Design a protein around this nucleic acid. Structure first.
Ligand SMILES: [Mg+2]
Length: 275
DNA sequence: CGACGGATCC
DNA sequence: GGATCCGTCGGGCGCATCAGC
DNA sequence: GCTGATGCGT
């Protein structure tokens, strides 16, 4: 029931070396995460691009340590206007993106701080913090409408292949969480969110990088509730993903789950691409 | 949301 | 009568606001 | 300014 992520594979199936390392992390409160040494772990991981979710932090409140990152000097931040202290995403990059945008169509009016889009030379990167269905599923219908708008937004992008990463807030299949049967009526594992995920993969279209490499591997999770010592018992959920355009699969070296990195109730995930 | 109690099924 | 299904319930976290001093 | 309570989301 415990899990050990396999060693990093830094070579593509055809023998090409990885050239791009992307790390994604739901940090559950950026200021808290930094106090718990999250940035020390980022420095050790040394990614080319770092995507963060649930920053819960407007840009003016960013800790100074974030200014002290020479290898991640291009930084883009989004926080909601009417709900500061919740949501918020960030994208930090070694190289400057060609284009950066926010939201999924109307962010200038519906300032939600959930999505950042960055176009690079060879690919487009989207990072997302997908809305939670909430306790008792009170916001499930909103989540379903959001999924539909997100799907259409990703499909409606004006060429290059897509990388989508972040907290998509759903365990796609039973293998993606410890207690599938007890959670069928809970946020993150309803038939509605599971279906929205399958529709995301088919509509865009996208592949689940981790599952593509490790289709039958159980007990691989990226989230554990703080309650009941769930993490120590690896009672968790896989909520964080790297979804790729089909054309990027031959460039895929590995998709990692960094189970040991502490500082949040999610752990980091890391992608290696040979571009 | 995992732990728990209580019902139901071979 | 062990395994399974199902509904209910308490509670760890971070951050905003507030009361008090 | 600082602490701890409460509310909210989860
Ligand atoms: Mg969270």
């Amino acid at each position: 029931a415990l899990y050990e992520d396999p060693p990093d594979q830094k070579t593509s199936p055809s023998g090409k070396p990885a050239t791009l390392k992307i790390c994604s992390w739901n940090v559950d409160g950026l200021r808290a995460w930094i106090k718990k040494k999250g940035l020390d772990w980022v420095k050790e991981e040394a990614p080319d691009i770092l995507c963060l979710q649930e920053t819960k932090c407007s840009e003016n409140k960013l800790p100074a340590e974030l200014q002290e990152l020479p290898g991640l000097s291009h930084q883009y931040w989004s926080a909601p206007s009417d709900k500061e202290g919740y949501s918020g995403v960030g994208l930090l990059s070694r190289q400057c993106p060609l284009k950066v945008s926010y939201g999924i169509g109307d962010e200038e009016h519906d300032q939600e701080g959930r999505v950042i889009v960055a176009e690079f030379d060879s690919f487009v990167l989207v990072t997302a913090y997908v809305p939670n269905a909430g306790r008792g599923l009170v916001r499930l219908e909103y989540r379903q409408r959001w999924d539909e708008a997100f799907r259409k937004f990703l499909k409606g992008l004006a060429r290059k292949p897509l990388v989508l990463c972040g907290d998509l807030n759903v365990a796609h299949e039973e293998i993606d969480l410890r207690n599938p049967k007890g959670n069928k009526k809970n946020a993150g594992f309803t038939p509605q969110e599971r279906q929205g995920f399958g529709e995301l993969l088919q509509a865009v279209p996208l592949a689940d990088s981790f599952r593509h490499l490790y289709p039958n591997t159980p007990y691989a999770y990226t989230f554990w509730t703080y309650m009941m010592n769930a993490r120590s018992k690896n009672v968790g959920w896989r909520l964080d993903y790297f979804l790729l355009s089909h054309s990027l699969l031959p460039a895929l070296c590995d998709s990692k789950i960094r189970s040991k990195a502490l500082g949040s109730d999610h752990c980091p995930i890391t992608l290696y691409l040979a571009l």
